Each structure stands twice: as structure tokens, then as C-alpha cells.
Design a protein around this ligand. Structure first.
Ligand SMILES: O=C(O)[C@@H]1C=CC(=O)N1C[C@@H](O)[C@@H](O)[C@H](O)[C@H](O)CO
Ligand SMILES: [Zn+2]
Ligand SMILES: [Zn+2]
Ligand SMILES: [Zn+2]
Ligand SMILES: [Zn+2]
Ligand SMILES: [Zn+2]
Ligand SMILES: [Zn+2]
Length: 491
């Protein structure tokens, strides 16, 4: 059988090292595999690495490669892993997670089936960063040939092979028979169809044109959950907030960032952008169960307009200032969150103008820091406490998909470095607790709410998993387990 999957947009690129957003990741996770990837239950799964060894100080890593092939019939070898990692590490390259993998200082290939990494500083989160959709392995010979071909047809080691891309319509993938997991994938093909207007996307599911859709809008969630011919797959992993370009003078000031945290009513965002679905955040967006979580620090901020006005005045803005907010019109919740922020900040004299291009245009600007501040709809990229480094650390790459451009605090860097180097979780928790105090004080990131992130499937679809908490954007991995009962589309 074949499955038609309605994506919320067309990927701007399938270039493995680039993080274009959830749409591109969902397609990449059908075609590609890394040394490890997260399993549907959130455990790290040995993928192209059949096994791995981590030194007791988390500085040396050995990967023993599984017998596996790429889609072009070539064997997966240690030289392919080294070339793939070197592309991520290249400082002149466009890898989105270069900062997080940059501690890799030596890559050894003693034989065709063994890769050894040595880090310059310890990292108990390195295995998790190797599970990123952007850390997948491609062939060294393929990279050499397609060095100046940004639109070259993908070659990977995942359960499906790239079959074609019709611009503005769909990407088709086909079962890879030589995939290393017995009985996987179950589907013969998946057609990833692009539905940028969310109403057309929901209508495609309800009218029976597609079998699965992602980014189910909050206004349609109840109708879809009711069915009986549709099923809603729930998750409450991502958060909504703001990333600030700290080169925009007012945003270099903790008092200005805190004023914004005090000025924005969180129920205005939940009620006007998410149909009343979600929960307010009054501190750092750390989920229950992660180090740094605290019930006592969960109400650092509150909604207090006159306090926000006093903070701006103290910061040197008694009459506020003019600024532009980058978001998108492609996701109604992003546009409506931006509209709510604009009206909330006008009350404290911050005159916000909105930039609402399509998703790919917003991402191109976000990637270069071409903004004053931007609506952040995101989550921790790994399920270890070190997901925080991707948001807060300084380092060599100061403009990232999840950070506040050019923010760099030595106390925060030192605490995150200590947190990543400490193996004992009883000691790590003291480190992240101290980090949280400094993160609130400086507020380089501001958080407003936890949101629902839902998929919807047609009755007859099984085995697709909306992966837990922060793993929801990697749910495309579960397509290898997905099955669909015999069916036709209007025939
Ligand atoms: O889920 C969202 O809301 C948006 C909407 C499309 C999408 O890919 N999103 C995820 C991105 O916002 C996120 O992966 C990325 O790191 C951004 O640069 C964070 O601001
Ligand atoms: Zn179908
Ligand atoms: Zn070994
Ligand atoms: Zn076909
Ligand atoms: Zn098709
Ligand atoms: Zn309120
Ligand atoms: Zn108010």
C-alpha cells in the first residue's frame, strides 16, 4: 500500500545538515539515518551504529557500524560517517547544529566498520546530538560529486529511497528493500503532499484526499478527534516565545527583555492564536522531568503592564521605541501570536511592525539573524538537559535556529559547560538549577506558553506515532512502522 501525507509546507531544502523546519525534517527522517536516532518511546536506538562505547568521562566515543547499504547500493562505511561529520563541523558551512557538534576534535576510521570520536571537552549529550535529523549519514563519494549541486537527488540509508520531487506539489519516496530492519518499512510508498494553507490541509483529510496530516490547527482538533473516520494523535511538547537579536540596541538589555515578559498577557496568545488550548509559562520553558525544572521558580514573571513600563523607563526608554517582529503568515498560530504581541507591547510604548512572509522566507531571515526579534515556536532539540546549550550558549556560531543572535554570557557558558561534563545527575541538577537563576535574570529568551502539537490520521492508518514531548518534530521517523488498510482515493 501507499500513504499520502499532508505536510504543512514544502521543504526549502533536503540538504541534510540544514534545519529548514518540521516539513523538511519529516521527509529527511523517511530517507535518512544517523549513527543513532530516537525510537518511538524516546530511547536512543542504535541505527547505522550497531553498538557504541562512551568513555567514563564522555570524551571518547567508538561506533561499531552495522552491515548496511545506501540507496545507490554502496556499503555504509566509516569514511562516509567521517565525511558527513566533517560537513557539519566545517566553519564555512551551513550546518544548523555546528555549535553543538563542534567539540568533536578528532575523527578516526581504524577500519571500514569503526568510527572513533575524541572531543576537546566532555559531553554527556553528544550521543543525543548524533540523533539529530541533521546528523544523518550520507556517502562520502556522493558528497564529493554533489559539492556544487544544492538540488542533487538525495542518497541515504533510511527505510525509503527518494523517488521524485514535483515542485509545489509533492515528494514521493519508495520502500528501500535493502534496509537493515526486518519487515520495515511496511508501506511501499509515501507521497508527502504540500498543503501550505491549513484549511486546505484539514479539508484534504476530511474529504479523503490524504491519509495523515501534520500541524492540525487548534480550531479543528475537537472535530477531528470526534471522528469517527479520523483520529487525533496528541502531544504538548513545544513552547511559544521570542528570540531577540541582541545587536538591536534595546534587546541587548535584560531589563527590556524582562519588560516584554511582564507586558505580554499569556491568555491573549492562548485564546486568540490557539483557540484556548495550551498553558501559560511564567519562567524558563523546562518540562517536568528535566533538570532545572522547579515549581518554586515557575512564577518568576507575571502579567504586569505598569511594572513593564517602569523597566523600560529604567533601561532608558521612557517613551518606548519602534521595532519589527518577524513571524510568518503560513501558520495561523504564528501570525496570531505576532498580532497579540504587537497589541500587548503597544500598551508599554513599543511600536511593533510585523513581517509575515511564508515559512521558507522567515527561516532564511532567521538563519542569518536578519531580524530585530522573532516569534519562536520550538522545543529542545534533544531530550538531555543540554538542549539548553542550543538556546543559551555563546560559542563560535552566534546565530542559530533557536538562540537570541549574539547573546554570550560567560557565567551561563561556564555552567552549561560544567553541566555537559558532569556525568552524575545528582551533581548535574545543582548546575542546571544555578543556570536557571541566571537564565531568568538575563532573559535572553522569553517564553509564553506550552502548545499542543497534533497529527491526524484517517481510520485505517496505524503505527504512526506523535513522538513524546520534545520529540514531536521527529515523528516522521515513525513512518517506518506505519501501516494502512487497503483503500482508494475517490475510486
Ligand atoms: O512549529 C513552529 O512553530 C514552526 C512552524 C514551522 C516550523 O517548522 N516551525 C519550527 C521552527 O519554528 C523551529 O524548528 C526553528 O528552530 C525556529 O527557527 C525557532 O524560532
Ligand atoms: Zn491513501
Ligand atoms: Zn569497541
Ligand atoms: Zn508508485
Ligand atoms: Zn503522489
Ligand atoms: Zn492574563
Ligand atoms: Zn495587559
Amino acid at each position: 500500500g501507499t500513504l499520502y501525507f499532508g505536510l504543512s509546507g514544502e521543504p526549502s531544502t533536503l540538504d541534510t545538515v540544514v534545519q529548514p523546519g518540521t516539513s523538511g525534517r519529516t521527509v529527511k527522517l523517511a530517507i535518512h539515518r544517523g549513527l543513532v536516532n530516537y525510537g518511538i518511546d524516546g530511547k536512543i536506538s542504535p541505527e547505522l551504529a550497531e553498538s557504541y562505547e562512551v568513555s567514563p568521562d564522555a570524551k571518547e566515543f567508538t561506533f561499531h557500524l552495522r552491515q548496511a547499504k545506501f540507496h545507490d547500493g554502496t556499503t555504509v562505511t566509516s569514511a562516509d560517517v567521517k565525511a558527513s561529520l566533517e560537513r557539519i563541523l566545517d566553519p564555512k558551512g551551513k550546518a544548523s547544529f555546528r555549535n553543538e557538534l563542534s567539540s568533536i576534535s578528532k575523527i578516526e576510521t581504524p577500519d571500514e566498520k569503526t568510527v572513533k570520536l575524541t572531543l576537546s571537552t566532555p559531553s554527556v549529550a553528544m550521543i543525543d546530538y548524533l540523533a539529530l535529523p541533521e546528523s544523518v549519514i550520507v556517502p562520502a563519494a556522493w558528497l564529493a560529486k554533489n559539492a556544487d549541486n544544492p538540488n542533487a537527488a538525495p542518497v541515504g540509508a533510511g527505510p525509503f529511497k527518494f523517488a521524485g520531487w514535483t515542485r509545489g506539489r509533492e515528494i514521493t519516496v519508495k520502500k528501500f528493500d535493502d534496509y537493515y530492519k526486518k519487515g520495515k518499512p511496511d508501506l511501499d510508498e509515501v507521497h508527502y503532499v504540500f498543503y501550505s494553507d491549513e484549511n486546505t490541509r484539514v479539508n484534504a483529510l476530511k474529504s479523503g484526499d490524504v491519509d495523515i496530516i501534520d500541524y492540525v490547527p487548534a480550531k479543528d482538533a475537537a472535530d477531528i478527534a470526534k471522528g469517527p473516520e479520523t483520529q487525533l494523535l496528541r502531544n504538548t511538547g513545544p513552547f511559544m516565545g521570542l528570540q531577540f537579536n541582541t545587536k538591536f540596541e534595546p534587546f541587548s538589555k535584560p531589563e527590556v527583555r524582562q519588560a516584554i515578559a511582564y507586558a505580554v498577557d499569556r491568555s491573549a496568545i492562548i485564546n486568540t492564536a490557539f483557540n484556548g488550548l495550551g498553558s501559560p509559562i511564567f519562567g524558563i520553558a523546562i518540562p517536568k522531568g528535566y533538570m532545572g525544572y522547579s515549581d518554586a521558580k515557575a512564577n518568576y514573571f507575571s502579567h504586569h503592564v505598569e511594572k513593564a513600563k517602569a523597566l523600560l523607563a529604567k533601561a532608558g526608554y521612557p517613551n518606548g521605541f519602534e521595532v519589527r517582529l518577524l513571524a510568518t503568515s503560513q501558520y495561523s498560530f504564528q501570525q496570531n501570536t505576532a498580532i497579540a504581541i504587537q497589541s500587548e507591547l503597544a500598551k508599554i510604548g513599543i511600536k511593533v511592525k510585523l513581517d509575515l512572509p511564508d515559512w521558507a522566507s522567515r527561516m532564511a531571515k532567521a538563519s542569518t539573524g536578519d531580524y530585530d526579534f522573532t516569534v519562536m515556536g520550538s522545543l529542545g532539540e534533544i531530550t538531555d538537559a543540554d538542549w539548553l546549550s542550543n538556546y543559551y550558549y555563546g560559542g563560535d556560531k552566534l546565530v542559530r535556529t533557536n538562540n537570541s543572535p549574539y547573546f554570550n554570557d560567560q557565567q551561563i557558558n561556564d555552567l552549561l559547560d560544567k553541566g555537559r561534563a558532569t556525568v552524575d545527575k545528582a551533581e548535574r541538577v545543582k548546575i542546571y538549577d544555578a543556570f536557571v537563576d541566571r537564565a531568568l535574570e538575563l532573559s535572553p529568551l522569553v517564553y509564553f506558553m506550552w502548545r499542543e502539537q497534533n497529527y491526524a490520521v484517517k481510520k485505517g492508518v496505524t503505527g504512526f506515532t506523535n513522538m513524546p514531548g520534545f520529540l514531536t518534530f521527529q515523528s516522521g521517523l515513525s513512518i517506518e512502522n506505519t501501516k494502512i488498510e487497503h483503500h482508494h482515493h475517490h475510486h
